[PDB]
Every structure is written in structure tokens, then in C-alpha cells.
Amino acid sequence: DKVMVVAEVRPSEDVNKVLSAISNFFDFEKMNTRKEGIIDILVLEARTLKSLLKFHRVLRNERILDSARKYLMKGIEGNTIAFMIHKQAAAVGVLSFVAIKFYIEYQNPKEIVDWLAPKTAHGVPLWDNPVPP
Amino acid sequence: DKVMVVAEVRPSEDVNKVLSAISNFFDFEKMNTGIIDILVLEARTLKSLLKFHRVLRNERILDSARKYLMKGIEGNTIAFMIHKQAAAVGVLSFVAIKFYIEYQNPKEIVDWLAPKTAHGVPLWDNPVPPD
């Protein structure tokens, strides 16, 4: 029941700018770094979906719930949801789906899509569920 | 007549790492700066490419450089690119880092930087072209 974000850091990149871009939407708890040549790979993890509260908030402040529901629904596979957001956009405080990789381990994935990406009527959320248990 | 290097600096990149990348092969005399920054570095003397000149010989890639440099000639300019990440780690690999050289006799630049070779050895060793 954890979330994991993976992102690369090339030699011209500043590991702290990548982590800071991710912090905009993810309050990670753990971090290990791995390599694939001259490229570092960040694997960030958190145990609770609460770690995605800032993600929940941005989808609303940006008014892109419509778009987020399709990307998230499409990203469901089994008991996991996987999606990607634009890295540079993220670096400037903007969330845009498409890189920063997100992986969510949860039994009822659908409850996650509805929690942060509800259907909308004229931009207004048709419902506002609490963070899934 | 000048040497100019242009490189992008994305929000996730460190301008210092990109400047260091270029520093491995070029010594700028001045620099200028959507959500992406464009770094423009330039020099007025060809001595600014002495590091480049040294690396092609040390790593013994003269043949490869001549090919890329010669084809890079258009009119009185020479245009070519090198790999950003490779350059960030000190490696010179020809293609995001763009080189633009203005000079009235471009082939001289090429023969200075990348002499034709026979059996892996430079057939000539010209001095840096004037200016």
C-alpha cells in the first residue's frame, strides 16, 4: 500500500532540482539512488496515500480533473496505477501528464482515481471523497 | 569572426554543469542568457578552441572530427554539435551543445583542429589560424 516515484538525473541535471520538482506533488519518505551508466535513477517511496495530498490539490487548482481522470484510469493495470508527468513542467510547479514516473500499490485502484480525479460538471467536482484508507 | 556556443538549460538542469561541460573544450570571453534558458557563449579568438584541439589529439579522433567539421562548413561559417551529457562528463562526442564558428577561410580551422591522418598520425601540424 505504498507509492513510488522514479526519475532520472543526467550529468547536466541537478539532483536537487529533480527532487524539488517532485516535492511539489509528492511528499516522499524514503530515497535510494541507482545507476545506469552516467545516469542516476531516483527511487522515492512513501507508505501512505497522504503522500499524494499535494497531487490531489494541484489537480484542482489547475482545473484539469477531466484530463487527470482519463490518464489515471488508463494507467490502472491490476492492483496498481502507473502514470507519468512532465519533468520540466513539474520543475516550474506545473503538473502535466504524459519524465517523472508514478507507481501506486493499492487493492482498489478505482478508489484512487475517484479520490483525486472526480467527474466534473462545468469544472465543479461532482463528489469529494476522503483519502482512501 | 568569432566562436559561439549555444546550449539549453532546462529547469531541471544546473547552468553550472552545462558551463562546466562546455569549459572542457571552449573558453568563452563573455556569455548571455518558454521555461527553458538558452546559454550563448562566445569568443573572438580561435585560441578559445585550444582545449578542443588538445582533446581531438589526446583521444585520437582526428579522422572523425575532420569528417564532421568539414561537412559542417556552409559558407564562411562552420556548424556542428556535440553530445551534452557526454560533454558534461568530459567526453567529446559529435552529433544539444551547438558550435558556430565564423571565419573567412573555414577549411583552415578544419586543417588546424583535425589534420588528415596517415596510420593514425597527423600529416601536418598547423598553428592556430590568425585572429
Numbering used by the authors:
A (entry chain B): 2 to 99, 109 to 143
B (entry chain A): 2 to 34, 38 to 99, 109 to 144
Paper lines:
The UPF0201 family proteins occur as a single globular α/β domain with approximate dimensions of 55×35×35 Å3. The protomeric structure consists of a five-stranded, anti-parallel β-sheet, five α helices, which are located on one face of the β-sheet, and three loops connecting helices and strands. We have further documented that all members of this archaeal specific protein family share a common polypeptide chain fold, which is evolutionarily related to the RRM motif found in the ribosomal L5 proteins and many other RNA-binding proteins.
For 10077b and 10077c from S. solfataricus and S. solfataricus P2, respectively, full-length constructs bearing C-terminal His6 tags yielded crystals and structures. The interface surface area for type I dimers in 10077a, 10077b and 10077d are 672, 563 and 611 Å2, respectively.
